[PDB]
Design a protein around this ligand. Structure first.
Ligand code: 7U8
Ligand SMILES: *[C@@H]1O[C@H](CO)[C@@H](O[C@@H]2O[C@H](CO)[C@@H](O)[C@H](O)[C@H]2NC(C)=O)[C@H](O)[C@H]1NC(C)=O
Ligand code: NAG
Length: 540
């Protein structure tokens, strides 16, 4: 027999069970109205004990740990702060002199942008993708484009996440209107979309180009009306829960979004940009750093009126300040962050920047060893992304080897250079007047018919049409590049195939390079990424 008379069992009342440390407005189009970051969520609970002692003490426990303590024996309420997300069992405990009573547990969801409230990303390998283990110690990266979820129908759950070390999210824009983002006007709707997203936001801060695709679009596993984070961002959160070692990096800029970088001669603008990136990574915690895609320091990007030789020093200062920011962000969060950047592979742009001074702040350099040739010229036909120079033009300097050796000659560490691999072909039509049975000696009359844009064809479609006998396949074994040709219509396409990719992986290994990366992940049927893993020595 004992003297044990604890209070009655508390009954929890009906209440909100879903909370968010980072609040997202599912019906907003402008970034400043779309997301509100805080450093904790506010959880509330009410309980009732029919004829209880209001002098009893009360405690709220989340997963058997105390988050609140006060008084409130007979009917009470509590409000408290939760700083880390997850699914919690909430219990109200009441105590008197004798003992304690415990509520039935109720589940609450505290959402945060590190995916702590979400299950791991469900994936099955599709098409020709085969599973690999990341045992080589090399970078195996790939770009995921934000707009690939519309007619391409490539959401994040189609990414072969076992076969990657890095996922680069293209693209994060920089706020700015006329004069600041003029390059965006070449894409229909793209400039006006940024202006809506940047509505009321200061220029030269990062933002989100398409808030619908990024956060509000229903995706696999994220379809409920009251899911805080859907779209690409919610799926990348679940990806981190499935592969915590896979680095997910946001890429700021690209071809049509690099114009604002040229104004960073003003340190005031550069300081605002860096501060917005710090705020950006605190808001979207699944990101593991920053990828800077400025195309290009000195010019010769999409805007023909931008560029200056002083861009090289601005680039080095930007990297110094971004790392300093990531250093203080490490001090607050205890995490390790990566600073990377995609740079032109052409010597005439490499020369602008002193990368050996910039490489001390950076983890990787994604060497854009592609787009060496394309349908922006009718008369200059060649390999888009070959390893070496071809036979008929041994002095070609736009090759993977020539650019790598030029960057190496600057004193850049070979373990930071990651060689680019093209998951797409660039092509011409109506090629005529060529000698020696070599279609590259002729001229085109225009771009080849493409998958989504004129002059560019997904590797998935190049492969399918080859199997269907719609192409004459050739492999230049000197330049280590494939191409398909159609003698009747003059259709020519230069691309990367499993063979040139493996040859690039052999070059990376032979010269002690950082690895391989590809643009863009959705144009692959699996053959190219498989070759990257095999070419770098990963385990199947
Ligand atoms: C696909 O997205 C892009 O814009 C893009 N990404 C990387 C490059 C690019 C990769 N290595 C390069 C090396 C040199 Cl030396 C130069 Cl100059 C450019 C590049 C390019 C691109 C350049 N010129 C273009 C013209 C039209 C189009 Cl569609 C694209 C490009
Ligand atoms: C490639 O050559 C073609 C023609 O051989 C050029 O297209 C012509 O030029 C302008 C461009 O719109 C048109 O007014 C003519 O009607 C075009 N003729 C054709 C092709 O039908 C084309 O501009 C060239 N491409 C480049 C970038 O030089
Ligand atoms: C293609 O155009 C260039 C323009 O300079 C010319 O030199 C070249 O001969 C042309 N090719 C053919 C096959 O006519």
């Amino acid at each position: 027999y004992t003297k044990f008379a604890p209070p009655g069992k508390p009954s929890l009342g009906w209440g909100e069970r879903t909370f968010a440390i980072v609040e997202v407005n599912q019906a907003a189009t402008a970034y400043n109205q779309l997301v509100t970051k805080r450093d904790s969520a506010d959880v509330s609970v009410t309980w009732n004990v029919w004829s209880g002692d209001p002098a009893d003490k009360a405690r709220v426990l989340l997963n058997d740990k105390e988050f609140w303590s006060g008084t409130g024996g007979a009917a009470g309420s509590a409000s408290f702060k939760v700083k880390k997300g997850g699914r919690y069992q909430m219990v109200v405990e009441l105590c008197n002199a004798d003992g304690c009573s415990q509520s039935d547990a109720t589940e609450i969801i505290v959402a945060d942008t590190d995916g702590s409230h979400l299950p791991p990303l469900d994936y099955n390998m599709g098409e020709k993708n085969k599973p690999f283990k990341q045992t080589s110690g090399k970078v195996v990266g790939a770009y995921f484009v934000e707009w690939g979820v519309y007619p391409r129908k490539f959401p994040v759950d189609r990414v072969p996440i076992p076969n990657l070390t890095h996922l680069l999210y293209g693209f994060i824009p920089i706020c700015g209107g006329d004069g600041i983002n003029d390059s965006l006007k070449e894409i229909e709707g793209s400039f006006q979309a940024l202006q809506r997203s940047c509505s009321g936001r200061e220029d030269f801060k990062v933002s989100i180009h398409d808030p619908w695709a990024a956060l509000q679009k229903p995706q696999k596993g994220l379809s409920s009306w009251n899911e805080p984070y859907k779209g690409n961002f919610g799926q990348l959160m679940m990806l981190k829960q499935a592969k915590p070692d896979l680095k997910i990096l946001p890429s700021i800029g690209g071809w049509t979004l690099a114009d604002p970088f040229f104004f960073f001669t003003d340190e005031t603008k550069r300081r605002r940009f860096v501060a917005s990136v710090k705020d950006f990574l605190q808001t979207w915690k699944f990101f593991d750093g920053v990828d800077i895609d400025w195309e290009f320091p000195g010019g010769k990007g999409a805007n023909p009126n931008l560029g200056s030789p002083k861009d090289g020093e601005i680039y080095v200062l930007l990297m110094k300040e971004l790392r300093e920011m990531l250093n203080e962000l490490s001090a607050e969060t205890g995490r390790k962050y990566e600073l990377t950047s995609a740079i032109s592979a052409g010597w005439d742009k490499i020369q602008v920047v002193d990368y050996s001074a910039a490489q001390k702040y950076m983890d990787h350099i994604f060497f854009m060893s592609y787009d060496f040739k394309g349908a922006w010229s009718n008369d200059t036909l060649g390999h888009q992304a070959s390893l070496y120079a071809p036979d008929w033009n041994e002095k070609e300097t736009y090759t993977t080897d020539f650019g790598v050796q030029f960057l190496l000659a600057q004193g850049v560490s070979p373990k930071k250079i990651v060689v680019g691999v093209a998951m797409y072909g660039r092509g011409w039509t109506g090629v005529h007047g060529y000698k020696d049975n070599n279609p590259f000696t002729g001229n085109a009359t225009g771009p080849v018919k493409g998958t989504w844009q004129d002059g560019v064809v997904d590797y998935r479609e190049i492969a399918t049409e080859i199997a269907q006998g719609k192409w004459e396949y050739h492999y230049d074994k000197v330049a280590q590049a494939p191409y398909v040709f159609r003698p009747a219509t003059g259709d020519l396409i230069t691309y990367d195939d499993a063979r040139s990719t493996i040859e690039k992986g052999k070059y990376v290994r032979a010269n002690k390079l950082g690895g391989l990366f590809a643009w863009e992940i959705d144009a692959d049927n699996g053959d190219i990424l498989n070759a990257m893993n095999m070419g770098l020595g990963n385990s199947a």
